[PDB]
Design a protein around this ligand. Structure first.
Ligand SMILES: Nc1nc(I)c2[nH]cnc2n1
Length: 284
């Protein structure tokens, strides 16, 4: 039971608490209702995100603070990208659709980053799709406002090396990992711990050094004793992605966050010359 919603049903466990599909009692509308598992600072800052509207961002409809509980109300979409890539594993997602989704996601990130809002925890479970061929990012801005098993697979290397500063580049990294996973039908870096995560990145991209990443050796959790692995070609990592897609991915996965392509620059990349917006085959 809820005093403002009916037919409340559990969708999943999210980063912050249970996620429900719910019907607004007044309007009849179906929404995603997120219970935040337990602060005044967070309420004003998340409430600012109610203004932050774009076709490729999941709309934060409301912030409800009642009975000393906090709920976030979002626009409901029928599938996430995790489920869609599982459902598409035999065939793969068609390349035009991968390109459409990556393009759209970059437009959402470019919008949020232009408004000084980061995600910091992008993952297939917070990328949501609809029947019309759109993809939208959920939960932008929540990590900065708020502070089972956490997925590390999309975490940028500076975060894993204990940098307590964030930048836009953390989201480009995450999205490049997602881009690779859509193409290969395998997670790029499926670490089960922070050091396994780090070392999976190093064994693909090479152990970073002061040449490719000035400042890295002074990172808080950098250890001079890290093994020194050589870097692999993207040609072996993401076949059969073409030269253009491999060049763009390379730029999204630079070690130094400052060298990583911006979302705005990535939209101009030659990979998107032939972008279209296809219809997905969604089984709901
Ligand atoms: N179905 C679904 N799941 C989640 I996680 C969502 N977050 C925002 N809208 C959502 N819709």
């Amino acid at each position: 039971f809820m005093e403002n919603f009916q037919k409340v049903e559990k969708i999943g466990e999210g980063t912050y608490g249970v996620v429900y599909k719910a019907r607004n009692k007044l309007t009849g509308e179906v929404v995603a209702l997120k219970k935040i598992r337990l602060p005044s600072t967070a309420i004003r800052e998340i409430s600012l995100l109610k203004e932050l509207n774009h076709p490729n961002i999941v709309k934060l409809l409301d912030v409800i603070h009642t009975e000393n509980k906090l709920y976030l109300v979002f626009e409901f979409l029928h599938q996430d990208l995790k489920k869609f890539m599982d459902a598409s594993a035999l065939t793969g997602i068609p390349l035009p659709l991968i390109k459409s989704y990556l393009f759209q996601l970059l437009q959402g990130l470019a919008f949020c980053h232009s408004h000084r809002v980061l995600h910091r925890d992008l993952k297939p479970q917070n990328l949501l799709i609809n029947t019309e061929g759109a993809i939208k990012l959920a939960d932008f801005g929540l990590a900065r406002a708020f502070g089972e098993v956490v997925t590390l697979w999309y975490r940028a290397p500076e975060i894993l090396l204990g940098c307590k500063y964030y930048s836009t580049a953390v989201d480009i990294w995450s999205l490049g990992c997602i881009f690779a996973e859509m193409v290969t039908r395998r997670a790029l870096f499926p670490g089960d711990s922070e050091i396994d995560q780090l070392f999976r990145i190093f064994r693909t991209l090479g152990t970073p050094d002061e040449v490719v990443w000035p400042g890295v050796t002074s990172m808080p959790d950098y250890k001079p004793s890290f093994p020194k692995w050589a870097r692999q070609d993207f040609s072996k990592v993401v076949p059969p992605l073409d030269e253009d897609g491999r060049s763009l991915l390379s730029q999204m996965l630079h070690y130094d966050p400052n060298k990583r392509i911006s979302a705005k620059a990535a939209l101009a990349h030659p990979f998107f010359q032939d972008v279209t917006k296809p219809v997905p085959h969604l089984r709901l």
